[PDB]
Write a protein that holds these residues in place. Structure first.
Motif, PDB file in Angstrom:
ATOM      1  N   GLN A 217      -9.092   0.111   3.624  1.00 28.73           N
ATOM      2  CA  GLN A 217      -8.207  -0.404   4.623  1.00 28.73           C
ATOM      3  C   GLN A 217      -7.406  -1.424   4.072  1.00 28.73           C
ATOM      4  O   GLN A 217      -6.384  -1.713   4.720  1.00 28.73           O
ATOM      5  CB  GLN A 217      -9.254  -1.167   5.579  1.00 28.73           C
TER       6      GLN A 217
ATOM      7  N   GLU B 264      -4.028   0.308   4.248  1.00 28.91           N
ATOM      8  CA  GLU B 264      -3.723   0.438   5.733  1.00 28.91           C
ATOM      9  C   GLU B 264      -3.159  -1.144   5.921  1.00 28.91           C
ATOM     10  O   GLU B 264      -1.807  -1.444   6.684  1.00 28.91           O
ATOM     11  CB  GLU B 264      -4.991   0.399   6.853  1.00 28.91           C
TER      12      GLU B 264
ATOM     13  N   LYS C 268       0.218  -0.578   4.082  1.00 26.65           N
ATOM     14  CA  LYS C 268       1.133   0.298   4.681  1.00 26.65           C
ATOM     15  C   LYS C 268       1.510  -0.069   6.145  1.00 26.65           C
ATOM     16  O   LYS C 268       0.702  -0.352   6.955  1.00 26.65           O
ATOM     17  CB  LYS C 268       0.390   1.641   4.699  1.00 26.65           C
TER      18      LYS C 268
END
Ligand SMILES: [Mg+2]
Ligand SMILES: [Mg+2]
Ligand SMILES: [Mg+2]
Ligand SMILES: [Mg+2]
Ligand SMILES: [Mg+2]
Ligand SMILES: [Mg+2]
Ligand SMILES: [Mg+2]
Ligand SMILES: [Mg+2]
Ligand SMILES: [Mg+2]
Ligand SMILES: [Mg+2]
Ligand SMILES: [Mg+2]
Ligand SMILES: [Mg+2]
Ligand SMILES: [Mg+2]
Ligand SMILES: [Mg+2]
Ligand SMILES: [Mg+2]
Lengths: 48, 203, 80, 210, 38, 102
Positions: free
Chosen positions: D204, D207, D210
RNA sequence: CGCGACCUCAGAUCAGACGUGGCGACCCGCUGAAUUUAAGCAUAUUAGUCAGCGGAGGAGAAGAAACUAACCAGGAUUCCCUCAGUAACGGCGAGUGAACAGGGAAGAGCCCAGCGCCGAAUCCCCGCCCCGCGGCGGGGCGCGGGACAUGUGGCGUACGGA
RNA sequence: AGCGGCCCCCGGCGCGCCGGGCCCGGGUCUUCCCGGAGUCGGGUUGCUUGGGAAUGCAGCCCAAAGCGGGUGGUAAACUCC
């Protein structure tokens, strides 16, 4: 219904070739029994 | 060599080739008798692999045997006893058809002693096996050091006692966490020393 | 499998030459006592023990046993 | 029908235990048969040791017998090679061989090797016939000592060590045995799940990146 | 029936052939020879 | 510091040094020699394929992967053997496409 | 339009060998119960036990890991002590019920096929000479018959090896 | 009773003499084998077992692979040993 891998043993030669073939190989035959004894006799006799 | 090419072939018992052949031979054998002698093998490689050498003194017979289970042989059902034992139909004999066939041939041919066997056919109600036999007193076998082990009086009627490959299976013999009976040599002997009481002198 | 022993029954694994030649010559002798030799693995803190700075070697220990030893001025050692 | 405060018991006699009882009345004769067989063998193998061949050193498997040592059944083919012996003549000298064994260390191997080398030192090998070709001992020792040994050969015995006294430094006084054991059990218990929550934390983090 | 067996067994009548087999085993089933003449 | 030889945890055991040598390549059984490979791929073209694996190659052309595996698993047994088989049969179709479409 | 072959197949008071039946204390393989216990009984237990059918030897069977284990690891099978009246099974009720490791008795390991080389380099029977003959063998000479290439013998079998 | 005597046969353990066989070892490189099918194995059924989401055995159906297969005492997948 005969499958092909067996069926191909029915597509064979004719007279004119088989004779030539057998007539040829009649020259190259293996050693006959007691033709072999003569061979050995003569062979181990070559030590003198 | 060639006996390998043959070997991988017979492992494919569903190709169009083998479906043809087997269907054809079962037709043939089904027309012959129940027991008859064959002149030579139909699975030569397999026979060599069990110990068939091609000399005179070794024999091949072929055997038929019917399929199914074992109906409890009594009168019209009515086993006289407990409800557990009213079973007559869904019963399964404790030896394989393969070993059954070896037995007939041994009983019919009494001098000849039995080495091993193999499978060659199948059908709805029949199943066909071939059996390999020996004459002990033929001098070709008596004078050969590596197969006269069987000319002793001890290897009589191996089939009647459970000493071939097909008989050894049903007994249950092995070494591991899966057997644990037959630690002696057999089930009886294990049962004995477990259910046998040892009374020493002094205690 | 974990055979147990207490502290009171510890100086009996060794002979009497040892415990007497300790507390003597004042080098910091501090002998060594293997329990796995005499058939014992874990050490337990039931009793007490006289004042000498012993060393011990064993696989396992208990909390109170570890305390009493350091309280007298010794040590504890682990092995496989 | 029980009564006042005894035990509850379950005896195994509900079968027919009585056709199948076994007396140890032949205990002495069984002893006597053996001696006369045990003597006679040693007379058959006249100078050779009565016990039999040589057997190796082997440690006992489990955590209970972790520590002890006993006699095995056969030297391995690895350790014979190191001595320079062939796996076929050894059976004739009096050496035992099992090839089902392995070796997952080096200090086991060197010991049994050093055992074999003492053996051939203390060995005596008669010549076949009076001529004395290779590896045939002299008549001198061959006559003086030619007698059997009593009992096993080069017997196995468990040696111990003697760690002498020494002064306790502070590095040992400041060691916390118990707490380290408790920490150790824990890390071995949570070694996987930590990484998995950490990997998912990092999967994560992408994530989050990103 | 134990009784029914033991009335006809190997050991009940004459045993006119086994009786000698027991006597011949005791020397080794020798044959084809004689003792020393006189 | 002062790490001792624990008897428990990630790194336990009376410590020793290992020996390394050739293994018992009796453990090298069931491996694929070239001559043996020449056999099995020759017999393949002669005798051919079986009906169930034939039935499957239909599903794989139409890309009904999931149903292919379940058919084979019922018709064979174990999940693993099915997974291996599906990959073989796919490679068979690969050479087919590769060989024909040219 | 007779011969070679086998798909193959029958016959003979043909020459030469063999098997059958009996005892059955100990052994191997199948088949296989009810009394009884449960204070009643139907699963269970009695019991893979009596009876039953076969097959043998002086022992038989098993047997040289498609093992045990989780250790700093052992190392064919068989019997003894112990593990153990335990783990587990169970109208979880009456009741049943093992193995490993440890210590001893004894201790011995090895052949084939298939790959692959060697002028089938191999086996049986009749004939003649010589030794030996009451557990019918050995040596030599027969362009004497036969089995065998639809595979006989030597080298060599995973101890990893060859 | 006696490491007492006389006679007879059967044993085996070893040294001589011709016959025939066998010319038959071990340390460093290139190839071989990876090896035994209606069989493992998987379903469903019945008997058995201390073996418990099936220890073992048998029938009927389906039916294999070759860095594969089996085992690793709770069913299944993913991975390391
Ligand atoms: Mg009382
Ligand atoms: Mg009889
Ligand atoms: Mg009742
Ligand atoms: Mg009553
Ligand atoms: Mg009643
Ligand atoms: Mg009942
Ligand atoms: Mg029962
Ligand atoms: Mg009976
Ligand atoms: Mg035997
Ligand atoms: Mg107790
Ligand atoms: Mg029971
Ligand atoms: Mg044991
Ligand atoms: Mg002993
Ligand atoms: Mg099965
Ligand atoms: Mg039961």
């Amino acid at each position: 219904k005969v499958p092909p891998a067996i069926n191909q043993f029915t597509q064979v030669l004719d007279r004119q070739t088989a004779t030539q073939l057998l007539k040829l190989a009649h020259k190259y035959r293996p050693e006959t029994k007691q033709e072999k004894k003569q061979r050995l006799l003569a062979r181990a006799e070559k030590k003198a | 060599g060639a006996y390998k090419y043959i070997q991988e072939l017979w492992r494919k018992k569903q190709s169009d080739v083998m479906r043809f052949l087997l269907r054809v031979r079962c037709w043939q054998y089904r027309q012959l008798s129940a027991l008859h002698r064959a002149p030579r093998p139909t699975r030569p490689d397999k026979a060599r692999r069990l110990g068939y050498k091609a000399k005179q003194g070794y024999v091949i017979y072929r055997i038929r045997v019917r399929r199914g289970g074992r109906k409890r042989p009594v009168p019209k059902g009515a086993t006289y006893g407990k409800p557990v034992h009213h079973g007559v139909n869904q019963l399964k004999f404790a030896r394989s058809l393969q070993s059954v066939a070896e037995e007939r041939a041994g009983r019919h041919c009494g001098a000849l002693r039995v080495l091993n066997s193999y499978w060659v056919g199948e059908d709805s109600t029949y199943k066909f096996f071939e059996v390999i036999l020996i004459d002990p007193f033929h001098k070709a076998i008596r004078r050969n050091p590596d197969t006269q082990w069987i000319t002793k009086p001890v290897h009589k009627h191996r089939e009647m006692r459970g000493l071939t490959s097909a008989g050894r299976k049903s007994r249950g013999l092995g070494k591991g966490h899966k057997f644990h009976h037959t630690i002696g040599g057999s089930r009886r002997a294990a049962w004995r020393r477990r259910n046998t009481l040892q009374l020493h002198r002094y205690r | 499998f974990c055979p147990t022993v207490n502290l009171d029954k510890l100086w009996t694994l060794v002979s009497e030459q040892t415990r007497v030649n300790a507390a003597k010559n004042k080098t910091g002798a501090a002998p060594i006592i293997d329990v796995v030799r005499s058939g014992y693995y874990k050490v337990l803190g039931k009793g007490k023990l006289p004042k000498q700075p012993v060393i011990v070697k064993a696989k396992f220990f208990s909390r109170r046993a570890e305390e009493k030893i350091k309280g007298v001025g010794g040590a504890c050692v682990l092995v496989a | 029908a029980p009564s006042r405060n005894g035990m509850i018991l379950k005896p195994h006699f509900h079968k027919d235990w009585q056709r199948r009882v076994a007396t140890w009345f032949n205990q002495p004769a069984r002893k006597i048969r053996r001696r006369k067989a045990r003597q006679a063998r040693a007379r058959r193998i006249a100078p050779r040791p009565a016990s039999g061949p040589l057997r190796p050193i082997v440690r006992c498997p489990t955590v209970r017998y972790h520590t002890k040592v006993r006699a095995g059944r056969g030297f391995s083919l690895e350790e014979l090679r190191v001595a320079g012996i062939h796996k076929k003549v050894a059976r004739t000298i009096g050496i035992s061989v099992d090839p089902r064994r392995r070796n997952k260390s080096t200090e086991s191997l060197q010991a049994n090797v050093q055992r074999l080398k003492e053996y051939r030192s203390k060995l005596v090998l008669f010549p076949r016939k009076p001529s004395a070709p290779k590896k045939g001992d002299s008549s001198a020792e061959e006559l003086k000592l030619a007698t059997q040994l009593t009992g096993p050969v080069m017997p196995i015995r468990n040696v111990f060590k003697k760690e002498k006294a020494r002064v306790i430094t502070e590095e040992e006084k400041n060691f916390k045995a118990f707490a380290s054991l408790r920490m150790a059990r824990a890390n071995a218990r949570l070694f996987g799940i930590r990484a998995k929550r950490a990997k998912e934390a990092a999967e994560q983090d992408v994530e989050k990146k990103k | 029936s134990a009784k029914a067996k033991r009335r006809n067994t190997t050991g009940t009548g004459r045993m006119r052939h086994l009786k000698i087999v027991y006597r011949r085993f005791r020397h080794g089933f020798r044959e084809g020879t004689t003792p020393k003449p006189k | 510091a002062l790490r001792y030889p624990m008897a428990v945890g990630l790194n336990k055991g009376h410590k020793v040094t290992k020996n390394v040598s050739k293994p018992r390549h009796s453990r090298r059984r069931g491996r694929l020699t070239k001559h043996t490979k020449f056999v099995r791929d020759m017999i393949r073209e002669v005798c051919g394929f079986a009906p169930y694996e034939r039935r499957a190659m239909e599903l794989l052309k139409v890309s009904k992967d999931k149903r292919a595996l379940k058919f084979i698993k019922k018709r064979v047994g174990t999940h693993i053997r099915a997974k291996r088989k599906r990959e073989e049969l796919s490679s068979v179709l690969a050479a087919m496409r590769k060989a024909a479409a040219k």
